[PDB]
């Protein structure tokens, strides 16, 4: 465990405006806290002048009443509004600083101790925790502490002995608070770690959603999510028990102190030290102070959790990169020529330090000559590029640029002078114009068009209906395989480099397109040096020099609450128990007041023996009620917290199931992206937990207190005015809370922050891409621009919450003061008695304090309405393609494999103007392989997407074994289909689990057999941990050939009747490609295949050869 930061450390992001907002909020909280005890003492001093003509007194007291009401209104408004706005400002600044600190970390930091889900969780949940600490909760804590201090001061003014003996309660409260905060901080640390793991599971599931549904992995993902959430719910159970114990102990100590105060006051009255009224005022003040201490628990609860979260964030924020770019003092060579050398480079990756990738590696790329880096799969090559880009510093060697060590000069102008086309083109979620513009932000439109033209990208871009502004793709999945690669080539070529690195730039392209791109590059590489990694002889022939790499060298209720209750029925037992506890607790509060007020009339009896006996009896009653309050506070808090934990866990499971049940058209939307979906789920769960589950107990307790106050008013026959004043707080609280909830339940602008979260997710998922193009500052600027609208919306919400709290406080104070005036007027005139009114008004004060505690929950209700609307909008949505229709034609156990497409007319939901298929009739024979060929955008992968019902054809019929796939069970039919994705990314797990993802249960021997049949066993066994090696966030800690061989092994261990396959032989050496192709041909004999090929030599015995020309039925015979 890591120790949390100091409380002061929470305020390192405050500026002058934040300081003045915090000061105004603190002044308002202090004045609001002192308003009540000074008001009571002022009435005590006002009684005499009220008894003592009348019109002048009434007018003066009315104007003083108006002044005090205005002061209370302003103070209670500021205490909420200023604190909310200041907390939001500091939280936004801290999020921006966290993103900026994370973005300029080393590359080795992102495959070691941070993931994309980790940063998303830090931006969302930990930041909300820190905000809740520095938001209006701090203002409430200051208000309660001011109330306690004011009560002690006025008690000291009235009776100094009683105030002094009251002052002995603070050490016990301090000890209880310290113990409770320590336990809560540790439990919250563990719970937050578990929740981060669960969020990682969710994000990884959504990112690879096509692979997840293709291999029927929704159930496994849901089970893993539930298993992760079980730990969090157990820690929540423990947290609720700890909170119950703390609140019970605090109430027990406060009530025992009350009884001791009562007995000591009786002793003082026995002598001639103090009279009745002074003890009355002191009892009132001490009661208010104890109630304030009781209500100040949620602030202390949030403080420790947010201290832990802020420690977690500040660990990343204060972390300094080990590369240590020499931005202040670098060489900054002026006229770079192009001579780049690797001299005696000994390099081993930080993730696997034992494996030495390069030993004594020497390679001199000349000033203006091209080097073709031929070599084996998983042997240098892409690592060498990572050395030139300064992704990793060489461990025991040197990298030189024009005879200058790269570590002695800043890497900013390096990456500005290097144009990189990586193995996997990492495209962002913006438009393709912004993706191309990443190379040079300050470029004209004509320059962008020229860069696209030379990179052979203009033809397919101008054909798009939206042109260059086409905003498609999260990982580029809304473009074809070659389109995103050509866009990456255009992006790299726009930034005119002196050194150009092409790590398999051609890779997956059509023959004509590949020739055009390579010729344009050749006429583009005349004056600049280039390092090219390519396993195709076409580029090698044109290359100037060739280097062979071997062995690392060179050779409302109706729609929100009742639906939750129906969903969460099998907890109404626990809730009921907790409910009664809360109710009981509230009763004691009222009851306690009554008892104390009764003692207030015993003090005046001259009979000392009878008075002493009454004092003793009431002291025993108070001790019994104190013990009961202890027990029932513990019970109510523990059970309400277990109810909240069950609520949140069931909500999370239901939301994840709803997300995973949807179709591709849903996932191909800007709102329904992986980082945004994960952030939505996490924020919704956190809001329905903290703002609803943690407030139901206090809501029902205060409601019960107010109702029992009204019931005692009816039983004891109070006047109609008194019961009206008692009822008024209930109506005010109900109206205010309903208004805040409806404000929350109607409208939002969280999508502005959701865009920032998604931008951070893309930036962290593509740290190599953002680093190579020096786009960290651009990402930070876009993040700040996205975060401003949430800042202003939260400003407005804080304004309305402060106004509501202020008006409610003013109404309560006005009602109480008018009641006080009426009661004193009744007593003076003798129309009513005295002791009865005293009990009436003590109970009234307790009820009003409970109502204020209820009113304190406005922002929580607003965010609870937000969360409820979000979760129910997610749940209500119904999918277009149901993953499993119960009433379907059964799938035969031995599927023949007669997959066909008849008159298929298909248009993607996104960009629906383009008609991908116009009357496409493709047929695959039973058990025979079929090859799909054509241009890049002809739709070869669209056929694969149509086979698995990712999207439905508009007017086409896709047929399986002579039966429509629509009338089959989608989950059942998907178990007989095995695919390999076009760009085979892996999950954030081991090789063993990645391969085992293909089949439900496949023990160990089957996994080994699949690995051998994919010719992947050799390198996996050569790894230090074998099949248990962690492969990275998306398989980043592996080469392309190894990743694709692992994907092939997974598709093989699926052992399906219809292996769709694809161009899975790319990114593989000629020998490796031949071995994999021979093994696949041997394994797939007798089973139908729909393999697509870009190199026609691979499909030598593919039987039927089908071309896709004009998106229609082209030649199919051969």
Ligand X SMILES: Nc1ncnc2c1ncn2[C@@H]1O[C@H](COP(=O)(O)OP(=O)(O)NP(=O)(O)O)[C@@H](O)[C@H]1O
Q: Which residues are annotated as a binding site for ATP?
A: 111, 349, 351-352, 380-383, 668, 908, 911, 939-941
Tokens 């496994």 belong to residue: 220
Work out how close the CB of 941 gets to Mg ion at its nearest, in angstroms, rounded to a whole number: 3
Does the protein bind ligand X through residue 984 (CB under 6 A)?
no
Q: What is the x/- site pattern for ligand X, positions 320-349, by CB under 6 A?
A: -----------------------------x
The radius of gyration of the chain's CA atoms, rounded to the nearest angstrom, is: 36
**Which amino acids are annotated as binding site, given as ranges?**
111, 258, 349, 351-352, 380-383, 668, 816, 853, 908, 911, 939-941
Does the protein bind ligand X through residue 941 (CB under 6 A)?
yes
Nearest to 771 by CA among 172, 271, 325: 325
Stated length of the chain = 1118
Work out how close the CB of 12 gets to ligand X at its nearest, in angstroms, rounded to a whole number: 33
Does the protein bind ligand X through residue 938 (CB under 6 A)?
yes
CB-based contact 451:490 (threshold 8 Å) = yes
Work out how close the CB of 939 gets to ligand X at its nearest, in angstroms, rounded to a whole number: 4
Please identify, using beta-carbon distances, which residue of 243 and 381 lies nearer to Mg ion: 381
**Which amino acids are annotated as binding site for brassinolide, given as ranges?**
258, 816, 853
- As a three-state string, the secondary structure of 75-90 is HHHHHHHHHHHHHHHH
For ligand X, which stretch binds (CB under 6 A), given 199-207, 320-328, 338-346, 473-481? 473-481
For residue 261, the partner it binds in ligand X, Mg ion, none, with Cβ less than 5 to 8 A by kind, is: none
Interface with ligand X: number of residues (CB under 6 A): 43
Does the protein bind ligand X through residue 423 (CB under 6 A)?
yes
Q: Backbone phi, then psi, for 370, in 5-degree steps?
A: -95, 135
Binding ligand X (rule: CB under 6 A), the pick from 39, 841, 908, 987 is 908
CB-based contact 279:268 (threshold 8 Å) = yes
For residue 73, the partner it binds in ligand X, Mg ion, none, with Cβ less than 5 to 8 A by kind, is: none
For residue 378, the partner it binds in ligand X, Mg ion, none, with Cβ less than 5 to 8 A by kind, is: ligand X
The residues near 990 (Cβ < 8 Å, ≥ 6 apart) are: 1025, 1027, 1028, 1029, 1030, 1031
For ligand X, which stretch binds (CB under 6 A), given 129-137, 310-318, 350-358, 996-1004? 350-358
Nearest to 395 by CA among 364, 423, 361: 361
Work out how close the CB of 220 gets to Mg ion at its nearest, in angstroms, rounded to a whole number: 26
- 137: which 2 tokens? 């909760």
Residues in 699-718 at the binding interface with ligand X, rule: CB under 6 A: none
Residues in 1059-1088 at the binding interface with ligand X, rule: CB under 6 A: 1067
For residue 377, the partner it binds in ligand X, Mg ion, none, with Cβ less than 5 to 8 A by kind, is: ligand X
Work out how close the CB of 792 gets to ligand X at its nearest, in angstroms, rounded to a whole number: 34
Region of residue 552 (left: phi > 0; alpha: psi -120 to 50; beta: else): left
CB-based contact 596:287 (threshold 8 Å) = yes
CB-based contact 780:100 (threshold 8 Å) = yes
Please identify, using beta-carbon distances, which residue of 261 and 502 lies nearer to Mg ion: 502
Measured between alpha carbons, how far is 858 from 422 in angstroms, rounded to an integer? 52
- Report the relative pairing of strands 963-964 and 957-960 from DSSP bridges: antiparallel
Does the protein bind ligand X through residue 351 (CB under 6 A)?
yes
Which chain residues interact with Mg ion by CB under 5 A? 381-382, 423, 481, 941, 982
Does the protein bind ligand X through residue 988 (CB under 6 A)?
no
Work out how close the CB of 479 gets to Mg ion at its nearest, in angstroms, rounded to a whole number: 9
Please identify, using beta-carbon distances, which residue of 282 and 379 lies nearer to ligand X: 379
Please identify, using beta-carbon distances, which residue of 173 and 365 lies nearer to Mg ion: 365
Taking each helix axis as running N to C, give the angle between helix 218-270 and helix 170-207, from 0 to 180 degrees, rounded to the nearest 10. 170
- 173: which 2 tokens? 């409260």
Work out how close the CB of 532 gets to Mg ion at its nearest, in angstroms, rounded to a whole number: 12
Does the protein bind ligand X through residue 672 (CB under 6 A)?
no
Please identify, using beta-carbon distances, which residue of 210 and 719 lies nearer to ligand X: 210
- Report the relative pairing of strands 1104-1109 and 1112-1113 from DSSP bridges: antiparallel
Does the protein bind ligand X through residue 479 (CB under 6 A)?
yes
Work out how close the CB of 506 gets to ligand X at its nearest, in angstroms, rounded to a whole number: 12
Work out how close the CB of 961 gets to Mg ion at its nearest, in angstroms, rounded to a whole number: 26
Work out how close the CB of 541 gets to ligand X at its nearest, in angstroms, rounded to a whole number: 20
For ligand X, which stretch binds (CB under 6 A), given 253-261, 481-489, 677-685, 963-971? 481-489
Per DSSP, the chain holds a count of helices (H) and strands (E) of: 39, 18
Work out how close the CB of 423 gets to ligand X at its nearest, in angstroms, rounded to a whole number: 6
Please identify, using beta-carbon distances, which residue of 532 and 705 lies nearer to ligand X: 532
For residue 1089, the partner it binds in Mg ion, ligand X, none, with Cβ less than 5 to 8 A by kind, is: none
Measured between alpha carbons, how far is 50 from 222 in angstroms, rounded to an integer? 70
CB-based contact 105:321 (threshold 8 Å) = yes
DSSP 42-100: HHHHHHHHHH--HHHHHHHHHHHHHHHHHHHHHHHHHHHHHHHHHHHHHHHHHHHHHHH
Q: What is the x/- site pattern for ligand X, positions 489-518, by CB under 6 A?
A: -------------------x----------
Measured between alpha carbons, how far is 567 from 1116 in angstroms, rounded to an integer? 54
Tokens 């903290």 belong to residue: 690
Binding ligand X (rule: CB under 6 A), the pick from 305, 458, 475, 940 is 940
Binding ligand X (rule: CB under 6 A), the pick from 299, 480, 634, 646 is 480
For ligand X, which stretch binds (CB under 6 A), given 633-641, 962-970, 984-992, 1036-1044? 1036-1044
- Beta carbons within 10 angstroms of residue 955's beta carbon: 10
Please identify, using beta-carbon distances, which residue of 496 and 941 lies nearer to Mg ion: 941
Region of residue 529 (left: phi > 0; alpha: psi -120 to 50; beta: else): beta
Residues in 372-411 at the binding interface with ligand X, rule: CB under 6 A: 375, 377-383
For ligand X, which stretch binds (CB under 6 A), given 71-79, 490-498, 909-917, 1095-1103? 909-917
> Is 894 exposed, middle or buried (CB count within 10 Å of its CB: 0-12, 13-18, 19+)?
exposed
- 517: which 2 tokens? 């791109």
Does the protein bind ligand X through residue 481 (CB under 6 A)?
yes
Residue 316 to residues 6, 102, 119, 320, 762, Cα–Cα distance (Å) = 16, 7, 10, 9, 18
Residue 262 to residues 586, 600, 898, Cα–Cα distance (Å) = 21, 9, 90
Does the protein bind ligand X through residue 192 (CB under 6 A)?
no
Please identify, using beta-carbon distances, which residue of 508 and 675 lies nearer to ligand X: 508
Does the protein bind ligand X through residue 1037 (CB under 6 A)?
yes
Measured between alpha carbons, how far is 58 from 419 in angstroms, rounded to an integer? 84
Work out how close the CB of 376 gets to ligand X at its nearest, in angstroms, rounded to a whole number: 6
Please identify, using beta-carbon distances, which residue of 189 and 662 lies nearer to ligand X: 662
Binding ligand X (rule: CB under 6 A), the pick from 370, 856, 982, 1088 is 982
CB-based contact 336:23 (threshold 8 Å) = no
CB-based contact 98:782 (threshold 8 Å) = no
Does the protein bind ligand X through residue 352 (CB under 6 A)?
yes
Residues in 101-160 at the binding interface with ligand X, rule: CB under 6 A: 111
Residue 1091 to residues 899, 1046, 1111, Cα–Cα distance (Å) = 13, 17, 18
Binding ligand X (rule: CB under 6 A), the pick from 412, 739, 911, 1074 is 911
Work out how close the CB of 653 gets to ligand X at its nearest, in angstroms, rounded to a whole number: 28
DSSP 162-212: HHHHHGGGHHHHHHHHHHHHHHHHHHHHHHHHHHHHHHHHHHHHHHTHHHH
DSSP type of residue 880: S
> Is 8 exposed, middle or buried (CB count within 10 Å of its CB: 0-12, 13-18, 19+)?
exposed
Work out how close the CB of 533 gets to Mg ion at its nearest, in angstroms, rounded to a whole number: 6
Handedness of CA 374, 375, 380, 383 (dihedral sign): positive
- For binding to ligand X (CB under 6 A), which residues are involved? 111, 349, 351-352, 357, 375, 377-383, 423, 472, 478-483, 508, 668, 908, 910-911, 916, 936-942, 982, 1036-1042, 1067
């Amino acid at each position: 465990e890591i120790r949390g930061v100091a409380f002061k450390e929470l305020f390192r992001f405050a500026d002058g405006l934040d300081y003045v907002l915090m000061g105004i909020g603190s002044v308002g909280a202090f004045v609001h806290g002192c308003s009540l005890p000074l008001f009571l003492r002022f009435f005590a001093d006002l009684v005499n002048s009220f008894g003592s003509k009348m019109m002048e007194e009434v007018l003066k007291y009315a104007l003083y009443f108006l002044v005090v009401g205005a002061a209370i209104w302003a103070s209670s408004w500021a205490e909420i509004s200023c604190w909310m706005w200041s907390g939001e400002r500091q939280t936004t600044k801290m999020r921006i600083k966290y993103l900026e600190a994370a973005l300029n970390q080393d590359i080795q930091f992102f495959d070691t101790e941070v993931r994309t889900s980790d940063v998303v969780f830090a931006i969302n949940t930990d930041a909300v925790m820190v905000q809740d600490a520095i938001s209006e909760k701090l203002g409430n804590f200051i208000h309660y502490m001011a109330t306690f201090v004011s009560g002690f001061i006025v008690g000291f003014t009235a009776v100094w002995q009683l105030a002094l003996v009251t002052l002995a309660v603070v050490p016990l409260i301090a000890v209880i608070g310290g113990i409770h905060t320590t336990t809560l901080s540790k439990l919250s640390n563990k719970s937050q770690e578990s929740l981060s793991q669960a969020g990682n599971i969710v994000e990884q599931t959504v990112v690879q959603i096509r692979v997840v549904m293709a291999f029927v992995g929704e159930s496994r993902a849901s089970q893993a999510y539930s298993s992760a959430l079980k730990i969090a719910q157990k820690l929540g159970y423990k947290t609720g028990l700890a909170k119950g114990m703390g609140l019970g102990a605090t109430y027990f100590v406060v009530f025992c102190c009350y009884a001791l105060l009562l007995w000591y006051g009786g002793y003082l009255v026995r002598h001639h030290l103090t009279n009745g009224g002074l003890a009355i005022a002191t009892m009132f003040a001490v009661m208010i102070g104890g109630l304030a201490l009781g209500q100040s628990a949620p602030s202390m609860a949030a403080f420790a959790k947010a201290k832990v979260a802020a420690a977690k964030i500040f660990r990343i924020i204060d972390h300094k990169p080990t590369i240590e770019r020499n931005s202040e003092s670098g060489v900054e060579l002026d006229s770079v020529t192009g001579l780049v050398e690797l001299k005696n480079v000994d390099f081993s990756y930080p993730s696997r330090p034992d494996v030495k990738i390069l030993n004594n590696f020497c390679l001199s790329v000349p000033a203006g000559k091209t080097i073709a880096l031929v070599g084996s799969s998983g042997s240098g090559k892409s690592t060498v590029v990572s050395l030139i880009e300064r992704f990793y510093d060489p461990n025991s060697g040197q990298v030189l640029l024009d005879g200058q060590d790269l570590k002695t000069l800043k890497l900013r102008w390096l990456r500005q002078q290097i144009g990189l086309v990586s193995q996997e083109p990492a495209l962002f979620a913006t438009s393709i114009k912004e993706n191309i513009l990443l190379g040079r932000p300050d470029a004209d439109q004509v320059e962008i068009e020229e860069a696209a033209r030379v990179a052979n990208a203009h033809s397919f871009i101008i054909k798009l209906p939206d042109g260059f502004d086409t905003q498609v793709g999260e990982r580029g999945l809304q473009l074809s395989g070659g389109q995103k690669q050509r866009i990456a080539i255009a992006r790299a070529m726009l930034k005119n480099p002196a050194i150009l690195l092409l790590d398999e730039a051609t890779s997956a392209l059509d023959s004509e397109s590949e020739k055009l791109v390579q010729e344009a590059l050749d006429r583009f590489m005349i004056g600049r040096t280039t390092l090219i990694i390519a396993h195709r002889l076409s580029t090698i022939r044109k290359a100037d020099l060739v280097a062979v790499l071997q062995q690392g060298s060179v050779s409302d209720q109706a729609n929100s609450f009742w639906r939750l209750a129906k969903m969460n029925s099998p907890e109404w037992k626990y809730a009921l128990l907790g409910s009664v506890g809360s109710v009981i607790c509230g009763s004691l509060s009222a009851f306690f007041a009554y008892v104390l007020s009764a003692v207030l009339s015993v003090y005046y009896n001259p009979d000392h023996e009878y008075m002493i006996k009454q004092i003793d009896k009431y002291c025993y009653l108070l001790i019994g009620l104190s013990s009961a309050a202890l027990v029932f506070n513990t019970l109510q808090h523990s059970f309400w917290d277990i109810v909240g934990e069950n609520l949140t866990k069931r909500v999370r499971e239901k939301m994840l199931s709803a997300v995973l049940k949807n179709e591709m058209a849903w996932f191909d939307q800007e709102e329904n992206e992986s980082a945004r979906i994960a952030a939505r789920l996490a924020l919704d769960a956190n809001n329905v937990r903290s703002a609803i589950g943690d407030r139901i107990s206090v809501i029902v307790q205060n409601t019960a207190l107010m109702l029992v106050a009204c019931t005692a008013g009816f039983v004891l026959q109070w006047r109609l005015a008194l019961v009206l004043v008692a009822v008024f707080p209930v109506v005010v609280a109900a109206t205010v809370l309903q208004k805040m909830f409806m404000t929350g339940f109607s409208g939002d602008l969280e999508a502005a922050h959701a865009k920032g979260t998604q931008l951070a997710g893309e930036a962290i998922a593509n740290v190599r891409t953002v680093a190579a193009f020096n786009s960290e500052a651009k990402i930070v600027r876009l993040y700040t621009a996205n975060l401003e609208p949430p800042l202003k919306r939260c400003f407005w919400k804080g304004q309305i919450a402060g106004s509501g709290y202020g008006v409610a406080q003013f109404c309560l104070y006005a009602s109480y003061a008018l009641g006080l005036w009426y009661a004193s007027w009744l007593v003076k005139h003798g129309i009513s008695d005295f002791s009865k009114t005293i009990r009436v008004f003590m109970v009234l004060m307790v009820s009003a304090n409970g109502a204020a505690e209820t009113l304190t929950l406005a922002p929580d209700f607003i965010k609870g309405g937000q969360a409820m609307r979000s979760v129910f909008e997610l749940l209500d949505r119904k999918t277009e393609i149901e993953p499993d229709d119960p009433d379907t034609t059964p799938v035969p156990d031995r599927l023949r494999g007669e997959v066909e497409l008849k008159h298929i007319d298909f248009s993607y939901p996104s960009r629906p103007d383009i008609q991908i298929f116009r009357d496409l009739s493709l047929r695959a024979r039973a058990g025979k392989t079929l090859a799909l060929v054509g241009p890049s955008g002809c739709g070869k992968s669209s056929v694969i997407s149509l086979i698995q019902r990712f999207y439905e054809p508009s007017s086409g019929r896709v047929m399986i074994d002579g039966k429509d796939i629509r009338k089959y069970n989608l989950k059942a039919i998907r178990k007989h289909i095995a695919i390999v994705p076009q760009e085979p990314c892996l999950f954030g797990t081991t090789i063993y689990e990645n391969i085992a993802y293909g089949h439900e249960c496949a023990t160990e021997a089957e996994i080994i057999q699949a690995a051998t049949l994919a010719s992947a066993h050799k390198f996996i066994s050569a790894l230090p941990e074998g099949y248990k090696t962690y492969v990275g966030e998306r398989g980043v800690q592996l080469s392309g050939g190894q990743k694709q061989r692992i994907a092939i092994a997974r598709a093989l261990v699926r052992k399906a009747e219809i292996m769709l396959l694809d161009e899975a032989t790319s990114a593989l050496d000629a020998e490796s490609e031949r071995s994999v192709q021979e093994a696949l041909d041997q394994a797939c004999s007798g089973r139908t295949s729909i393999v697509v090929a870009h190199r026609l030599s691979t499909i030598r015995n593919a039987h039927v050869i089908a071309v896709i020309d004009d998106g229609k039925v082209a030649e199919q015979g051969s």
